Structure 1
Amino acid sequence: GFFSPGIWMGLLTTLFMLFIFTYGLHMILSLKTMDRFDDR
């Protein structure tokens, strides 16, 4: 067979936490700093 109960259950939990990681990283990557500072 292509998949086992072990392998599959692993993949199912892996994807859920992978989506969480993707969500977190997504917002982290879309994070900018300032072009310039306001004043002296």
Structure 2
Amino acid sequence: GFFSPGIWMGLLTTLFMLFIFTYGLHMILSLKTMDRFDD
């Protein structure tokens, strides 16, 4: 077989964690800094 039950379990769990991680990574990676200072 191309898969075994434990493999499917681990794959689904890792996929969930990976989706959550890439969401967080997108949000942090869009951060930008200011250009000039006041006064």
Q: TM > 0.5 between the two?
A: yes
Gaps of 5+ in 1: none
Q: CA deviation digits over 1:3-37, x for unaligned, max 9?
A: 11011100100011101100100001100000111
Residue 18 of structure 1 corresponds to 18
Size of the aligned set, in residue pairs, is 39
Gaps of 5+ in 2: none
| TM-score where L is the length of structure 1 | 0.87
Question: What CA RMSD, in Å, does the superposition of the two structures yield over aligned residues?
Answer: 0.7
After TM superposition, the runs of 4+ consecutive aligned structure 1 residues lying more than 6 A away are: none
**Amino-acid identity (%):** 100
